[PDB]
Write a protein that binds this DNA or RNA. Structure first.
Lengths: 138, 136
RNA sequence: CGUACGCGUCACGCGUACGUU
RNA sequence: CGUACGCGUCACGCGUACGUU
């Protein structure tokens, strides 16, 4: 039940009530904008946070600029993630996961809920490194 | 599968086995006896693994968390050792490559198509450095 | 730490099919 | 980009069985 909600949360845009790890709405292109863009470097990246069975996802446009980098880095925070986790974490430990994919490479951070703080430090760092691997241009 | 089985076994070839491996340092897994003993007196080391398609190699290296040791285990593999070892399995067709490492409850897995193998190595080494430097 | 399996879940590669939200 | 099937795999959470290498 909560799993189906977290899945649909990706499309609640502004409104919504289910606590989420993300602080910026999804930006998935319509199928049309997609193929149309693939006639002209990547539109953006995709990422997801999962607290057990409850997985949340986001596709964010990212043009590789400094401004753009700073913007998507605010997609989530340790706080936003910890707060959302408390709402679905029992007195038990469950598998948690953060995963991001860009320019083909995919990074996945994972472990039990007890290490969530560490998952968050690793995830934020992996995120910036993956998004800054030697520019596609050169 | 066979080549997959030789790769699994490579971990235990101890002293050369003729098989091309992405790793440059010999495994250092503790015997079940040495392990029980240590778990009586944080962890002994960490586990990493490289896979090219289903041809997976692995290692467990002792790590104590000192700059000296960090530099040592950081050499268990290089861009060169990985790429070369990969060529002998390339396959001319794209296959799913991978790198995973686990230390202190946290696991990092870098996944990519053979074409992106050069970036995988970049992300993998950075993930490795960072992960091994996490402190409670 | 090493084998094998079970329940749940996640991610990559290859093949393919649908969708002009 | 989305949603799906198929084949091959990285790996995590929970738990069993087996191993004096």
């Amino acid at each position: 039940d909560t799993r189906e909600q977290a899945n649909g949360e990706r499309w609640d845009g502004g409104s919504g009530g289910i606590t989420s790890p993300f602080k910026l709405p999804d930006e998935s292109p319509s199928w049309t904008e997609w193929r149309l863009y693939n006639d002209e470097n990547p539109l953006g990246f995709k990422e997801s946070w999962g607290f057990g069975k409850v997985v949340f996802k986001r596709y964010l446009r990212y043009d590789r600029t400094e401004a753009s980098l700073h913007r998507v880095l605010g997609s989530w925070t340790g706080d936003s993630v910890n707060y959302a986790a408390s709402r679905f974490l029992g007195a038990n430990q469950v598998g948690c996961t953060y995963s991001i994919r860009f320019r083909g490479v995919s990074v996945t951070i994972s472990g039990g809920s007890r290490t969530l703080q560490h998952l968050c430090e690793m995830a934020i760092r992996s995120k910036q490194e993956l998004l800054q691997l030697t520019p596609v241009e050169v």
